[PDB]
Every structure is written in C-alpha cells, then in structure tokens.
Design a protein around this ligand. Structure first.
Ligand SMILES: COc1ccc(C(=O)NO)cc1NC(=O)Cc1ccccc1
Ligand SMILES: [K+]
Ligand SMILES: [K+]
Ligand SMILES: [Zn+2]
Length: 401
C-alpha cells in the first residue's frame, strides 16, 4: 500500500510551533477534502516503552547533552520567569536561539517528527507499505549537537539510520528543498552506503552556505565515504523545465549505479514560484509539468521502497496544493489506479484559506553552467563506483546526459 503518517495527537503537535503554525492541518485537510484518505494506509507515530528507550532512539544520532538541553528548554518555556544567565549560555552552546528559539512545546514538537519518520521507515522495512509519506517530517538541517534553520531534531538521519541497519543495504537520499541538505549530508559524510544528493539554491550569504564550491573545489565525502555526497547548486530564477532537465539525468544515473535498497526524498516546497523566498519558479502544475511531480514520478518508476518527507514551505495553502498533488501521484504510480482531482478546491474546514480564486493550481504565470556540473557529477559518480567496486556500463550512463 501507500502509507501516510497522521493521528490526532500527531496533528496537534505538528501544529504547535510558531514558525510553521497550522500548515500541517491545511495539508492533511486538503488531502482529506480530495477524498484521498480512503486510498491510504494510516501509519501511526512510533511511541516508546520508557524514557530510556526514547533516549536510546534519539541518541542514535544526537548527543545526550543536546537532547537534555532541548528538553530543558521546553520545561523553562512552560514557566513564567525568564531564563537565568547560565541557562542562556547553555542554550547558546547548542544554538538553541535566534532562528531556533524555545516555545512551550519545542521538545514534543521536535520529537513528534522523529516518531513519524521512524514509524514510516519501519512500515517500509516490514513491507507493509511500498511508499510512505510524512508531511510532518523532513527537518534536514539539525546536527548531532546543534539546532539549525528551525530544525531541532533530524528525523531524516534517524529514519535513514534505521533503514541502512535493517540488513548489502544502500540508501539514496534526494533533497529537493530550496536549501542545501547540510545536516543529512554531514551525518553520512564518511558512509558509502548512504549516498546523498541535494539540489538547491546557493549564493553568497544565502543559508546555510554549503553545497557549493569550497580554483576552489567541491568537497564530496571523506574516508570510505569519499565521492558519496552529491550537490547541484543552481542560480535563482529557474523554471520547471530547466530544473527538471538539470536533475533528471543525475537521478537516473544515481539509481543505475547505486542500485539503492531504499530511497528517501525530502520534498520541501520552498522552490515554488509563490513561496515568499521568491528564488526559484517551480509550480505544482500537472498537464509545464511541475519539477516536483516530474522528480517524484521518475523516482517512483524505479519501484524501490521509498520514503517521501516534507520540509520547507512558507506559503501554507500553496504548500498544501503541491503536497496534495504529490500524494495523488504516489497513489496512481504505486497502485496503478487513476486519481482524478478537480481543478477547484472542495469545500472543507479550511476552504477560506484558498481565496480569492479557490483553484488547485498555484496562482502563477510562466545552461552552460549546468552542462559543466553534469560533467563534474558524472566523473564523481564514476570515481564513487570505482572506489566501491561497483558494476555498471559507462555507456548507458554517459548517454543519459
Ligand atoms: C535562517 O532562515 C532559514 C533557515 C532555513 C529555512 C529552510 O526552509 N530550510 O530548509 C528557511 C529559512 N528562512 C526563513 O524562514 C525566512 C522567512 C520565510 C518566511 C517568513 C519569514 C522568514
Ligand atoms: K535541497
Ligand atoms: K555519504
Ligand atoms: Zn528550505
């Protein structure tokens, strides 16, 4: 089946942060309004037998002292008085500040995404589902002992760790967010079994700053993980077609060479033309074909067990519009059953948020650099396969580009 993570408590926690507000409710309620929920298997978030088991899972990646600090931050924000100077210094030491502030539910909110994405990986491993979706997950910036970019716990890293250890097992991670997937890339920098690939904007001063030239050179992993971290940085303004042609051949070549056992996809919606970032010009159109739907369709055509996660996306109704179409397309590709979605938003709880026109399309009217990157990336893929003693014909792959 196609699985999707939701639940009453899960919904409440995912809607409890100051930055993402009620976005998750819009997404799941638009999916429901389009009558997709009967087609999907509900995957319940993971819960644990004890505090010690919870810590054992989360500290598979994060440090005990960082988890302690994040939980203390929640407790301090549930009291009336301000932080002490010593507690401020403590939170500063883990970057629990500025763009990663405290709020009354910060630990439960962050933990919930881990619970959902771990539960999703388990549903793939036991073969209950062929694909699982978690629109509450996808927080790719968090590090072992550091919050970053409103990411406090890295649910992606923990989900991937569960997949690679279920065994040889290899995972391909594809990061479609506007931003570089630095936290996931870093966690697996020395690991050849998890190949990471992020496409993103990069430019001087733009967050988080990595995933680009370091004549400077491209770092790409280390140790036995050399050549296992891939990046495609793109200039602002790119449309659906140029973005699709940029990543399409890379995706096909990665699958041919790596032969992954699982694929994990981060589908942050901040590349939409209507995102307040206003950097890329992608759409959710489905006849121009949305770069997002082009990529998901290609990935799903591989017939490899796949985890689809959320991420960025700061125009909440347009993020719901996109993720509803990704959800419908996943059902259609996996089940071979046609999903017909009306071009008009159906009546439901949040109908008023899709004014003034109430349509499913977003409200938008629409290379020598990329050829150079393709040559660079093809040579890196060759070096990866040589180092890891992997089989493949340079011809079938070269001709993809
Ligand atoms: C440090 O800033 C960020 C770090 C990570 C991400 C992200 O999406 N990562 O994948 C995004 C931002 N930036 C913003 O949220 C900017 C913004 C957008 C809408 C309304 C107000 C401000
Ligand atoms: K990305
Ligand atoms: K790696
Ligand atoms: Zn982002």
């Amino acid at each position: 089946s196609v699985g999707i993570v939701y639940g009453d408590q899960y919904r409440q926690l995912c809607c409890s942060s100051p930055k993402f507000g009620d976005r998750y409710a819009l997404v799941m309620d638009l999916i429901n309004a389009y009558k997709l929920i009967p087609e999907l298997s509900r995957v319940p978030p993971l819960q644990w037998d004890s505090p010690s088991r919870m810590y054992e899972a989360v500290t598979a990646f994060h440090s005990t002292e960082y988890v302690d600090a994040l939980k203390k931050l929640q407790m301090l924000h549930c009291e009336e008085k301000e932080l002490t100077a010593d507690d401020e210094l403590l939170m500063d030491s883990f970057s629990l500040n500025y763009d990663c502030p405290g709020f009354p539910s910060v630990f439960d909110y962050s933990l919930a995404a881990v619970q959902g994405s771990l539960a999703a990986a388990s549903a793939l491993i036991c073969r209950h589902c062929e694909v699982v979706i978690n629109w509450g997950g996808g927080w790719h910036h968090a590090k072992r002992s550091e919050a970053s970019g409103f990411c406090y716990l890295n649910d992606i890293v923990l989900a991937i760790h569960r997949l690679v250890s279920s065994t040889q097992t290899r995972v391909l991670y594809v990061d479609l967010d506007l931003h570089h997937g630095d936290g996931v890339e870093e966690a697996f920098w020395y690991s050849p079994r998890v190949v990471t690939f992020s496409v993103h904007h990069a430019s001087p001063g733009f967050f988080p700053g990595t995933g680009t030239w370091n004549l400077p050179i491209f770092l790409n992993g280390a140790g036995r993980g050399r050549f296992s971290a891939f990046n495609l940085p793109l200039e602002e303004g790119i449309n659906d077609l140029d973005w699709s042609n940029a990543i399409g051949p890379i995706l096909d070549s990665l699958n041919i060479v790596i032969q992954p056992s699982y694929v994990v996809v981060q589908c942050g919606a901040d590349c939409l033309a209507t995102d307040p970032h206003r950097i890329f010009r992608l759409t959710n159109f489905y006849p121009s074909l949305s770069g997002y739907l082009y990529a998901i369709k290609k990935i799903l055509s591989w017939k490899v067990p796949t985890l689809i996660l959320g991420g960025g996306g700061y125009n909440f109704p347009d993020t719901a519009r996109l993720w509803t179409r990704v959800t419908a397309l996943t059902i259609e590709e996996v089940k071979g059953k046609k999903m017909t979605i009306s071009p008009e938003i159906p009546e439901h709880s949040y109908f008023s948020r899709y004014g003034p026109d109430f349509e499913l399309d977003i409200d938008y009217f629409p290379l020598d650099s990329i050829q150079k990157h393709h040559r660079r990336i093809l040579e890196q893929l060759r070096n990866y396969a040589d180092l890891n003693k992997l089989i493949y014909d340079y011809d079938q792959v070269y001709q993809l580009y």
